[PDB]
Amino acid sequence: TLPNYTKRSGDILGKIAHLAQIEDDRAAMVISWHLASDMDCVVTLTTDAARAIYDETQGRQQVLPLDSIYRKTLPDWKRPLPHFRNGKLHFKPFGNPVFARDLLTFPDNIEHCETVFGMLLGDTIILDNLDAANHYRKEVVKITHCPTLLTRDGDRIRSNGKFGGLQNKAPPM
Amino acid sequence: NYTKRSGDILGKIAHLAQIEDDRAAMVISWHLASDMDCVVTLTTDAARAIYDETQGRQQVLPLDSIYRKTLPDWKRPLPHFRNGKLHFKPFGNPVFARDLLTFPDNIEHCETVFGMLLGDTIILDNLDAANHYRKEVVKITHCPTLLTRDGDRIRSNGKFGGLQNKAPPM
């Protein structure tokens, strides 16, 4: 619920991802992998602690302060998928794109972690396959910036456009 | 232009576009050199063809999947400006990394691919300035990659620290 400091911050998040009621075991796997793979740093609440850790480690320890992560403004209903330009459909997508966050259902007991998740996950989108993902990005980028894309096949297309390599593939089941 | 060491090529032509600050030049080239351990293609079709034949083992990056900043490109200020207001007084003189490059007439074409690959990356004087910049920028909008003239990187996701994010001595 509260902050858990570890160099293996990903492990904790990947474990919580399997706790939030996810209907697709495939989507469950890639969403947990994506967090576990990215958070190989120490997550702090504030920059002050993140840099204190950084400084004592002579910059050797990777850190990430949550106070340096942009928080979505109140109209989260008014946050549609990037294929919607001005409250209307710009292009027709494939592989059922959906915000990764929108797949999680945090129960009332451990609902205090829904915030940190929605932050760390952000605008990442889950599509069915790489063909769908590849297409989505090509089109989205014609009108706006494109977030990280994860495929239900366990693939990642980084927000910078980079895809491919074993770095961007979730281990089998 | 289709090699695995695409970063090496970019890092080399970074030292060609004359940047006044030798410190800023080092960070900008290191930043591009560190990032591309990937094959850069013009189109997704070729990037995936390379991916497929490699059984997804080779990292790729198609330029047709990069947001090529629209016509009023120059009319876009640093993030400490929003809705036509200076939101805070920043430290360490933030400046778009791209704005430091001056591509000569012979190589006026590589200016495009550079401005794309570099993107909205900002170069500040030091980490203290950068840490502050990000804390404040993120209060109003998304914050790009921050590079310090001391050779430090603060990834767009907020991650800083580790040897992954520090340029080699000189």
Q: Is A138 on the interface with B (CB under 8 A)?
A: yes
Vertex B23 angle, CA B18 and B29, to 5°: 65
CB atoms B62 and A141 under 8 Å: no
Say how many CA atoms lie within 13 Å of B16 toward its Cβ.
Answer: 15
Q: How many angstroms separate the CA atoms of B133 and A133, rounded?
A: 33
Q: Is B65 on the interface with A (CB under 8 A)?
A: yes
Resolution, rounded to a tenth of an Å?
3.3
Say how many CA atoms lie within 13 Å of B164 toward its Cβ.
Answer: 12
Q: List the determination method.
A: X-ray
Residue A155 Cα, gap to closest chain B Cα (Å):
9
Query: Which residues from chain B sit within 8 angstroms of residue A144, using beta carbons?
Result: 67
Is-contact B137 B143, C-beta < 8 A?
yes
Q: Summarize chain B as % helix, strand, coil (round to 5).
A: 40, 10, 50
Is-contact B160 A54, C-beta < 8 A?
yes
Helices assigned H by DSSP within B3-43: 6-14, 22-35
Quick one: CATH architecture of B6-165? 2-Layer Sandwich (3.30)
Q: Is A144 on the interface with B (CB under 8 A)?
A: yes
Give the start-to-end residue ranges of the domains of chain A.
9-168
Quick one: CATH architecture of A9-168? 2-Layer Sandwich (3.30)
The 3 state secondary structure assigned to A93-110 is: CCCCCEEHHHHCCCCHHH
Distance of CA A148 to the CA centre of its chain: 7
Q: Is A8 on the interface with B (CB under 8 A)?
A: no
Q: In this structure, what DSSP letter does residue A87 have?
A: S
Residue A48 in tokens: 């002050």
Radius of gyration (Cα) for chain B, nearest Å? 17
